[PDB]
PDB file of N, CA and C in Angstrom:
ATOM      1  N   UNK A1159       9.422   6.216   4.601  1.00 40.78           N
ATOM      2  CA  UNK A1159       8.292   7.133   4.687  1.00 40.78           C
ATOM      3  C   UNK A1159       7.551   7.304   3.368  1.00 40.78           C
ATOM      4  N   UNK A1160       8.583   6.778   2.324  1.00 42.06           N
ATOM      5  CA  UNK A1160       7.433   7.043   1.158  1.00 42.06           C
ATOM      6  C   UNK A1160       6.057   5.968   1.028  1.00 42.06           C
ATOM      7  N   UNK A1161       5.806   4.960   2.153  1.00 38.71           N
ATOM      8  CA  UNK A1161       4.600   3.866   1.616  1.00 38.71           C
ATOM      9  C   UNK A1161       3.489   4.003   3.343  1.00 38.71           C
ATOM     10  N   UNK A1162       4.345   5.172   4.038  1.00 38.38           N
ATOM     11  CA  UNK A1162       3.836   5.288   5.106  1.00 38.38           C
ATOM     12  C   UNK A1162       2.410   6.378   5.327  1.00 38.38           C
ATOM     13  N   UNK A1163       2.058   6.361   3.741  1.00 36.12           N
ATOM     14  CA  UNK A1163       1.635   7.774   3.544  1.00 36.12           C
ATOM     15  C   UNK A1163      -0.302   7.106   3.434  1.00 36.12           C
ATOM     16  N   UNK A1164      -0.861   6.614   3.393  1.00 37.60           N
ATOM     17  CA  UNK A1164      -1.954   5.898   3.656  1.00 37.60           C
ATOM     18  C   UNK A1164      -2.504   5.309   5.229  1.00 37.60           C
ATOM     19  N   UNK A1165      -1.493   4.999   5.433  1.00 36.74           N
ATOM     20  CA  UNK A1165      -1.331   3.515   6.551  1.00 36.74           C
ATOM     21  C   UNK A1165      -1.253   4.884   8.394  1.00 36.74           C
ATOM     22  N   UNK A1166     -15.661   5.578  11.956  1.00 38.89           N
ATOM     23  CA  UNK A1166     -16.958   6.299  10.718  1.00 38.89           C
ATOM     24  C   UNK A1166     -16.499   6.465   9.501  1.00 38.89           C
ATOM     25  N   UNK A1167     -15.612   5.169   9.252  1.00 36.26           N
ATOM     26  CA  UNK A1167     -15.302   5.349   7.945  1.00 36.26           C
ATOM     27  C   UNK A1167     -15.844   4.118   7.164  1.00 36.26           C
ATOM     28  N   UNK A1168     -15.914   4.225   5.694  1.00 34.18           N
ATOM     29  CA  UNK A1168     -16.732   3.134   5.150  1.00 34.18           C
ATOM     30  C   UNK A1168     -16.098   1.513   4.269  1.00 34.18           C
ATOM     31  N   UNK A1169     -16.728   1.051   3.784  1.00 35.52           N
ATOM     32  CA  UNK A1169     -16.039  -0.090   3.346  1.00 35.52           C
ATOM     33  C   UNK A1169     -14.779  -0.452   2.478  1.00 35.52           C
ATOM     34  N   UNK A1170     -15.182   0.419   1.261  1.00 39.82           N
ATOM     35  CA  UNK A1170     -14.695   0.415  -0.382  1.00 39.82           C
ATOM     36  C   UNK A1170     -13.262   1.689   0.175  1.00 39.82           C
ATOM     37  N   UNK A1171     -13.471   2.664   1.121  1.00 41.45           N
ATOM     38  CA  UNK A1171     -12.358   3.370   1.050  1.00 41.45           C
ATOM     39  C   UNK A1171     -11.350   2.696   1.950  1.00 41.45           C
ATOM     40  N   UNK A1172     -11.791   2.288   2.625  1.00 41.38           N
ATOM     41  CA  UNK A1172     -10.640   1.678   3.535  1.00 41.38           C
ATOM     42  C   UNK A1172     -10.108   0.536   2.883  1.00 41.38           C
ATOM     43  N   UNK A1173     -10.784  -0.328   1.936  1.00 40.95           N
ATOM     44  CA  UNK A1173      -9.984  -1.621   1.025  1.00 40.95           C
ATOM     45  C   UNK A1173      -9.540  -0.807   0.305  1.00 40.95           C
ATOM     46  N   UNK A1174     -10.148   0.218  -0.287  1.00 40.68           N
ATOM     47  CA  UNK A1174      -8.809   1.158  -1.263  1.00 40.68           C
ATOM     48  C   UNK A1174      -7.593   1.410  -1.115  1.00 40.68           C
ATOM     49  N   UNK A1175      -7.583   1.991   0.340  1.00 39.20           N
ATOM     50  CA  UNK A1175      -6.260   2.673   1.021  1.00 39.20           C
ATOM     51  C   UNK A1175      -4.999   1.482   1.567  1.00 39.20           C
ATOM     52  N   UNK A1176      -5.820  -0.068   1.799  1.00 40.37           N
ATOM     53  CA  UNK A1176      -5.167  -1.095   2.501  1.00 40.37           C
ATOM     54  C   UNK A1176      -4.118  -1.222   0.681  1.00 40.37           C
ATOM     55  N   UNK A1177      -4.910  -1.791  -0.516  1.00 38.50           N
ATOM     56  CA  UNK A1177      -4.505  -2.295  -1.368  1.00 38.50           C
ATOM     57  C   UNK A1177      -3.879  -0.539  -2.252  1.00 38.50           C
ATOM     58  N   UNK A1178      -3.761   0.299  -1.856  1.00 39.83           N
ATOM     59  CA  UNK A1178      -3.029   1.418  -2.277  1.00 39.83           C
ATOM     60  C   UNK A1178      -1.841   1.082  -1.382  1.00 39.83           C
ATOM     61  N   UNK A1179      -1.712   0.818   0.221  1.00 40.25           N
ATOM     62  CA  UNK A1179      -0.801   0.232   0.540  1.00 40.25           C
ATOM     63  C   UNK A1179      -0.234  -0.678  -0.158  1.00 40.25           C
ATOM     64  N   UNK A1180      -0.851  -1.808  -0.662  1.00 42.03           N
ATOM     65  CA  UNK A1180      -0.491  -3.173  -1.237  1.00 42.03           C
ATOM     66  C   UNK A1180       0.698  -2.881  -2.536  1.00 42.03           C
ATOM     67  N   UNK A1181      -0.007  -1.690  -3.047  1.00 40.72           N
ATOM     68  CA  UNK A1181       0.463  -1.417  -5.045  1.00 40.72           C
ATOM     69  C   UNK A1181       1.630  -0.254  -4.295  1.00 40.72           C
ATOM     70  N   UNK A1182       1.284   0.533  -3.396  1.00 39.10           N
ATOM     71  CA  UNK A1182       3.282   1.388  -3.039  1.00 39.10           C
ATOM     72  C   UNK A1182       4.454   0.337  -2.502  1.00 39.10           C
ATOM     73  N   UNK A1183       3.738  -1.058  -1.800  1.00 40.00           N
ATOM     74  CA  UNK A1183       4.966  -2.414  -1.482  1.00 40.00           C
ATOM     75  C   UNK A1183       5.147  -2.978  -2.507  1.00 40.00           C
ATOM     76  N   UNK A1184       4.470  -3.454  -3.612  1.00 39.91           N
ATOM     77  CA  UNK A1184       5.201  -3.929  -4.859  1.00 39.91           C
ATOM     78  C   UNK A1184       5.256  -2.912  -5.554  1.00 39.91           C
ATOM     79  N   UNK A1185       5.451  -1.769  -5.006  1.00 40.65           N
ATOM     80  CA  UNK A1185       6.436  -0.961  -6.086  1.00 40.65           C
ATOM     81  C   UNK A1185       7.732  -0.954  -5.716  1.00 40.65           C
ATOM     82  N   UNK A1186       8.128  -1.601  -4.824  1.00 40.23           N
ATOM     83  CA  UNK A1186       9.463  -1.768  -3.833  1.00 40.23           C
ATOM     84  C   UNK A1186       9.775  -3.360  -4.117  1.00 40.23           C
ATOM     85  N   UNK A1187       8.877  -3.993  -3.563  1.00 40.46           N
ATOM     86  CA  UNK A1187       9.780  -5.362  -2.938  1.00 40.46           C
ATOM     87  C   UNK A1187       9.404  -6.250  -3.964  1.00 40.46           C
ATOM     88  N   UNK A1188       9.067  -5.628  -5.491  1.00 39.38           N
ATOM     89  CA  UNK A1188       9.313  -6.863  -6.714  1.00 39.38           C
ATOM     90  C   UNK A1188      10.729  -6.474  -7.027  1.00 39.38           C
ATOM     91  N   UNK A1189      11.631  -5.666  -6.906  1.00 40.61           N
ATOM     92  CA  UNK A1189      12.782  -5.919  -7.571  1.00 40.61           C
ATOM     93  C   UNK A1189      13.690  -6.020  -5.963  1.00 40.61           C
ATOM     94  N   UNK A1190      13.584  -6.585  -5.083  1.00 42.42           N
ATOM     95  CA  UNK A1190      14.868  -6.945  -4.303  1.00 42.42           C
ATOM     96  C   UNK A1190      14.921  -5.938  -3.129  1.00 42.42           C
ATOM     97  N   UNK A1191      13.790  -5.680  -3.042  1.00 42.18           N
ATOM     98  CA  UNK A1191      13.922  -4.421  -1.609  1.00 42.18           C
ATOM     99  C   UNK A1191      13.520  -5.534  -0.414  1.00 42.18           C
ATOM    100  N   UNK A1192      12.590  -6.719  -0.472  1.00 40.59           N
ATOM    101  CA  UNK A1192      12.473  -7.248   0.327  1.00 40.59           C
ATOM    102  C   UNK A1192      13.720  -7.859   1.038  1.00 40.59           C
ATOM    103  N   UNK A1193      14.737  -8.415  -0.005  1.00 37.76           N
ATOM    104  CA  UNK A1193      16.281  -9.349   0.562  1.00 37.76           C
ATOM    105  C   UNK A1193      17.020  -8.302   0.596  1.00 37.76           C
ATOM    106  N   UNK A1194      16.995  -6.945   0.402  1.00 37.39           N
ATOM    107  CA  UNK A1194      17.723  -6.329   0.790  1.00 37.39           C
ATOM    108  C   UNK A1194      18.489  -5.966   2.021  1.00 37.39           C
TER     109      UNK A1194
END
């Protein structure tokens, strides 16, 4: 639940919120959360 927190609206906020998704998953799955 902690990366679940993003995930008539306009362009730039919604690529914000996708790649704010992007930067809370490599805050996880660069050190081994992915093979975990």
């Amino acid at each position: 639940k902690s990366c679940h927190l993003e995930e008539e609206v306009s362009f730039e906020e919604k690529e914000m919120e996708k790649q704010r998704l992007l930067y809370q998953q490599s805050r996880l799955h660069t050190r081994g959360a992915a093979e975990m």
